[PDB]
């Protein structure tokens, strides 16, 4: 079926995504988009055989068989659209061969960004940074050694205080390692905060 | 869930080990299906049934078997596992309509391994919330790490006062290589929980990351010095610190 799809695309919160699918088939009998949570279960979204655009709430699904394209339309997008999006299509029997699959990861909107790096001591190596409250623009790189370990992004969610906030973990075994320097290799924010 | 079930949701073996995974269902669809799932790959079809004891070839259906005795299960046998059959494994069923979707089970991780020996179990520690986050932003991060496991099949879950939480929470989506270079490198997986300043300083207050790790069992040979890595839960906790 020669599909074609984008491996990544990143969108914020409140914008629409557009998310791509190309393919190429004799006895074209439709188009699918699955939802696919990383591991869980991929979920149907939408089929397409007719040319047009269809309207699901907030998605939309678009075909052109002359083209040999479709579109998943995401509006509003939330929190919970960051999956991959997967395009299939049909079809001895009638089993669709699926594309590769696209990850989106949606952005939240930081209203308040507080951009500070914490030492936190174990409970009971030792101790861990934390580089939180940034803005959804801040890039995190992936350590240059070696001996340090630095997470990539992750969005937390108060719920009952409607409050989303980014943060990064670095840590390291080595002695040399301090939370000053942990995030040296990353772009990060000049008024970061970095107590006390 | 949808009456989809994959048994066992995961496991970890020598190669050479047979390997059986069971996809059942409650719904009765005519058809099921088999997939693995690889990175840089869509899903690929392994073996499907088409009734009962009706089964026909996937696109990757070397070194698998599949068995379909009645409506409700669908069964895959890997004969001798080999390493390249690592992999997450999801069944699926439905009416083998054009114009309708399949239904998905959740998915199996299996892990093929030449040698047992690099198979670990987590440690676990939970770092307590830094006093100057707590003066800055009146909130407080708890971060938990899980480190030297492998292979990648844990779950990592917070309790507070012995009550499973989700609000506040956010656990990496993928885990990082401790030795990116080394091949089966074991890993790390960090989580947060971020609570109130308030809810902190309550010394009643009970934070305890959980992590279950799938790992071997009774069938699988073990001969190292350390204990035997079988499924088992590690667990580290904090206690609230009064003002």
């Known amino acids: 079926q020669n599909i074609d799809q984008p491996t990544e695309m990143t969108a914020t919160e409140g914008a629409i995504v557009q998310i791509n699918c190309t393919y190429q088939?004799?006895?074209?009998?439709?188009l699918f988009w699955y939802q696919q949570h990383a591991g869980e279960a991929p979920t149907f979204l939408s089929y397409?055989?007719?040319?047009g655009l269809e309207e699901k709430g907030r998605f939309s699904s678009f075909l052109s068989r002359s083209k040999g394209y479709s579109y998943l339309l995401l509006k509003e997008l939330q929190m919970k659209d960051s999956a991959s999006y997967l395009c299939?299509?049909?079809?001895?029997?009638?089993?669709?061969?699926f594309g590769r699959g696209t990850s989106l990861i949606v952005h939240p909107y930081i209203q308040n960004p507080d951009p500070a790096v914490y030492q936190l001591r174990d409970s009971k190596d030792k101790s861990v940074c934390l580089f939180t409250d940034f803005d959804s623009q801040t890039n995190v790189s992936q350590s240059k050694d070696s001996d340090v370990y630095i997470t990539d992004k992750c969005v937390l969610d108060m719920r009952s205080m409607d409050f989303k906030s980014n943060s990064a973990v670095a840590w390291s075994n080595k002695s040399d390692f301090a939370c000053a320097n942990a995030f040296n290799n990353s772009i990060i924010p000049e008024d970061t905060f970095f107590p006390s | 869930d949808a009456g989809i079930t994959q048994s066992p949701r995961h496991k970890v073996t020598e190669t050479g080990t047979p390997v059986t995974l069971r996809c059942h269902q409650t719904?009765?669809?005519?058809?099921m299906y088999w997939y693995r799932q690889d990175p840089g790959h869509g899903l690929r079809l392994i073996h499907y049934?088409?009734?009962?004891?009706?089964?026909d070839k996937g696109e990757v259906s070397d070194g698998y078997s599949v068995s379909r005795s009645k409506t409700e299960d669908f069964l895959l046998t890997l004969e001798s596992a080999t390493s390249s059959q690592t992999s997450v494994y999801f069944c699926?069923?439905?009416?083998?309509?054009?114009?309708?979707?399949?239904?998905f089970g959740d998915g199996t991780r299996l892990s093929i391994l030449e040698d047992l020996n690099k198979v670990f179990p987590p440690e676990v520690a939970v770092f307590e919330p830094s006093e100057a986050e707590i003066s800055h932003t009146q909130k407080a991060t708890l971060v938990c790490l899980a480190t030297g496991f492998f292979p990648d099949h844990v779950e990592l879950s917070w309790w507070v006062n012995g009550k499973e939480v989700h609000s506040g929470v956010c656990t990496d989506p993928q885990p990082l290589k401790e030795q990116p270079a080394l091949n089966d490198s074991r890993y790390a997986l960090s989580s947060r929980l971020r609570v109130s300043a308030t809810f902190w300083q309550n010394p009643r207050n009970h934070f305890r990351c959980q992590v279950q790790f799938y790992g071997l069992s009774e069938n699988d040979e073990w001969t190292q010095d350390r204990a035997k890595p079988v499924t088992q839960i590690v667990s580290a906790e904090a206690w609230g610190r009064a003002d």
């Open positions: 699926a069923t439905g009416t083998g309509d054009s114009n309708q979707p399949q239904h």
């Open positions: 299939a299509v049909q079809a001895g029997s009638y089993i669709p061969t």
């Open positions: 719904e009765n669809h005519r058809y």
């Open positions: 049934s088409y009734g009962v004891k009706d089964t």
């Open positions: 088939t004799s006895g074209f009998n439709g």
């Open positions: 397409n055989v007719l040319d």
